[PDB]
Enzyme design. Structure first.
Site: not given
Ligand SMILES: CCCN(CCC)C(=O)c1cc(C(=O)N/C(=C\c2ccccc2)[C@H](O)CNC(C)(C)c2cccc(OC)c2)cc(N2CCCCC2)c1
Length: 329
Positions: A34, A214
């Site tokens: 990530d 990302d």
């Molecule tokens: C398609 C299903 C898979 N999935 C989630 C299930 C595991 C995602 O791809 C997803 C991942 C993240 C996320 O936080 N990614 C990160 C880590 C992560 C954590 C837990 C599980 C999987 C991945 C990254 O560290 C986050 N990156 C930043 C901080 C830049 C960020 C911040 C805010 C929003 C965001 O998403 C685009 C990304 C956020 C989201 N969102 C964005 C839309 C609203 C609902 C929540 C989705």
């Protein structure tokens, strides 16, 4: 190759995963790799939640190189929260290992049903130091400081469903992954791998937008106002009470993302953001695009962008390198 390669495994064409190990006996885990976060964590055997019982768990007692920390820590993701304490042990990525600080997660309930639905055990952040909780030096920087790699950089070549596997490459840029020019964009912060690009989609234009590369996000995100204006008169349908946009799969009005800087130009065609629901007649598709507002107007270039473009994450030069990914290896 002179570099460290970790194989990326595709999962349903939207997310990818890689394996790494903790402990001197190298207990194996599946991680989201990530660039969008900066902490490494693994679920503990001391975690007894329903979710943890479905995962690979870390047992410090089976590792001779384990060293106690115990400092309590809580990671707050958008989805939710995992909590535990810091620990230090040998972390092995590919054919390199280093003693490293990470989080032993003991509580998983605040991160459900996301955690159980997913096929990762933990998350291995690849961002910059100021982005981490507890200010942990990024793995790749430490590996560089220890002269175990030539450059403090890593690269992502994403897998595509049964056409080729993918690679997280640590230590150098391999020409086998890309074609055409490799262009560099200076980071506007040493925090996320975030760069400044003019974003053009159709009729709407946003100059000098913040763009976060990302790998931990499987969608493209767009400012909500931008998304509204983007789709007007494009025959795209907002699903009532849900955050999803739906369209006919053969919709020729679907626009191509255009991101431009002084150094380069990157585009993302509908092929990279269309998800097929049902291929009856013209077809029913869903846009892999999410409206999302940050204090500063921001695009998140997640996996769909990286599936088209080979990307280079250079700590030494504080930049992101972008090039057209080779269709096959
Ligand atoms: C398609 C299903 C898979 N999935 C989630 C299930 C595991 C995602 O791809 C997803 C991942 C993240 C996320 O936080 N990614 C990160 C880590 C992560 C954590 C837990 C599980 C999987 C991945 C990254 O560290 C986050 N990156 C930043 C901080 C830049 C960020 C911040 C805010 C929003 C965001 O998403 C685009 C990304 C956020 C989201 N969102 C964005 C839309 C609203 C609902 C929540 C989705």
């Amino acid at each position: 190759s002179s570099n460290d390669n970790i194989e990326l495994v595709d999962f349903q064409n939207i997310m990818f995963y890689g394996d790494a190990e903790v402990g001197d006996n190298q207990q194996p885990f599946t991680f989201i790799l990530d660039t969008g976060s900066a902490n490494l964590w693994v679920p503990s055997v001391k975690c007894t939640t329903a979710g943890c019982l479905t995962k690979h768990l870390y047992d410090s007692s089976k590792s001779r190189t384990y060293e106690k920390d115990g400092t309590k820590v809580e990671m707050n993701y958008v989805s939710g929260t995992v909590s535990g304490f810091f620990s230090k042990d040998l972390v092995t990525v590919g054919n390199l290992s280093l003693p490293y600080k990470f989080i032993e997660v003991i509580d998983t309930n605040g991160f459900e049903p996301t955690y159980t639905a997913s096929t990762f055990d933990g998350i291995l952040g690849l961002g910059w130091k100021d982005l981490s909780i507890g200010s942990v030096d990024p793995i790749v920087v430490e590996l560089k400081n220890q002269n175990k790699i030539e450059n403090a950089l890593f690269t992502f070549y994403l897998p595509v469903h049964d056409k080729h596997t993918g690679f997280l490459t640590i230590g150098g840029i391999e020409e086998r992954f890309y074609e055409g020019p490799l262009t560099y964009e200076k980071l506007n912060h040493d925090l996320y791998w975030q760069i400044t690009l003019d974003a053009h989609v159709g009729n709407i234009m946003l100059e000098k937008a913040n763009c976060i590369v990302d790998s931990g996000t499987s969608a493209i995100t767009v400012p909500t106002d931008f998304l509204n204006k983007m789709l007007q008169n494009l025959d795209v349908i907002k699903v009532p009470f849900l955050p999803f946009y739906v369209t006919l799969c053969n919709n020729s009005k679907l626009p191509t993302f255009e991101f431009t800087s002084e150094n380069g130009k990157y585009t993302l065609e509908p092929e990279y953001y269309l998800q097929h629901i049902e291929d009856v007649g013209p077809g029913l598709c869903m846009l892999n695009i999410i409206g999302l507002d940050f204090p500063v107007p921001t695009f998140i270039l997640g996996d769909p962008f990286m599936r088209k473009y080979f990307t280079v994450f250079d700590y030494d030069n504080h930049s992101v390198g972008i090039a057209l990914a080779k269709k096959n290896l």
